[PDB]
């Protein structure tokens, strides 16, 4: 494998790893402090930006299947903290 | 609609895939660091991952040609020492 290929596969692996964790935790129930701390450590090690983190959170909370799963595993309202956690950032202006 | 039982199984599957995906990613980065080991212990608590599961994933990863090639490119030829010991773990990783 070439240098760029190794970097590409590794980066994809990292992004996929973070998304898989978000999915799992989201399906278990709402975000707890324990989980948020774990996520903070995980995003650090995998080089996941806060913006990317928020995107995975919203995607996950919008996932109707993950929601159905949470719904059954821990209740109807078990997406409260996740929904806030994922809120987009104030919109700047094109370019900066 | 999906039944509560199916949800439980999907959830289990997500937990297992999530831990595997992290093991894979970390392995491609290089050898397991102390920081990385602690992260995996916390992960395995939250995702309810048995010591046997942990070993299988590590053994798979450390013996995966692709992942290993990435690790050498990323950090040098001795990127398996710690992963090898982890593959032989019998006591709980902890957190």
Swiss-Prot record, chain A:
Domain ENT: 6-90
Post-translational modification: O-glycosylated during cytokinesis at sites identical or close to phosphorylation sites, this interferes with the phosphorylation status.
Region (Interaction with ZMYND11): 94-96
Compartmental location: Nucleus
Subunit structure: Homodimer. Interacts with the transactivation domain of BRCA2. Interacts with CBX1 (via chromoshadow domain). Interacts with ZMYND11. Does not interact with CBX3 or CBX5. Component of a nuclear receptor-mediated transcription complex composed of at least ZNF335, CCAR2 and EMSY; the complex stimulates the transcription of nuclear receptor target genes such as SOX9 and HOXA1. Within the complex interacts with CCAR2 and ZNF335.
Role this protein plays: Regulator which is able to repress transcription, possibly via its interaction with a multiprotein chromatin remodeling complex that modifies the chromatin. Its interaction with BRCA2 suggests that it may play a central role in the DNA repair function of BRCA2. Mediates ligand-dependent transcriptional activation by nuclear hormone receptors.
Note: Defects in EMSY may be a cause of sporadic breast cancer and higher-grade ovarian cancers. Overexpressed through amplification almost exclusively in sporadic breast cancer (13%) and higher-grade ovarian cancer (17%). Amplification is associated with worse survival, particularly in node-negative breast cancer, suggesting that it may be of prognostic value. Was named EMSY by PubMed:14651845 because the protein sequence contains the word 'SISTER', after the first author's sister, who is a breast cancer nurse.
Protein's recorded name: BRCA2-interacting transcriptional repressor EMSY
Species of the source: Homo sapiens
The encoding gene: EMSY
Part of the intact protein present: 11 to 106 of 1322
Swiss-Prot record, chain B:
Function statement: Regulator which is able to repress transcription, possibly via its interaction with a multiprotein chromatin remodeling complex that modifies the chromatin. Its interaction with BRCA2 suggests that it may play a central role in the DNA repair function of BRCA2. Mediates ligand-dependent transcriptional activation by nuclear hormone receptors.
The protein's name in its UniProt record: BRCA2-interacting transcriptional repressor EMSY
Domain of life (superkingdom): Eukaryota
Post-translational modification as stated in the protein's UniProt record: O-glycosylated during cytokinesis at sites identical or close to phosphorylation sites, this interferes with the phosphorylation status.
Domain ENT stretches: 7-91
Assembly behavior: Homodimer. Interacts with the transactivation domain of BRCA2. Interacts with CBX1 (via chromoshadow domain). Interacts with ZMYND11. Does not interact with CBX3 or CBX5. Component of a nuclear receptor-mediated transcription complex composed of at least ZNF335, CCAR2 and EMSY; the complex stimulates the transcription of nuclear receptor target genes such as SOX9 and HOXA1. Within the complex interacts with CCAR2 and ZNF335.
Residues that span the membrane, as ranges: none
Location of this chain's protein in the cell: Nucleus
Residues of the full protein shown: 10 to 104 of 1322
Other comment: Defects in EMSY may be a cause of sporadic breast cancer and higher-grade ovarian cancers. Overexpressed through amplification almost exclusively in sporadic breast cancer (13%) and higher-grade ovarian cancer (17%). Amplification is associated with worse survival, particularly in node-negative breast cancer, suggesting that it may be of prognostic value.
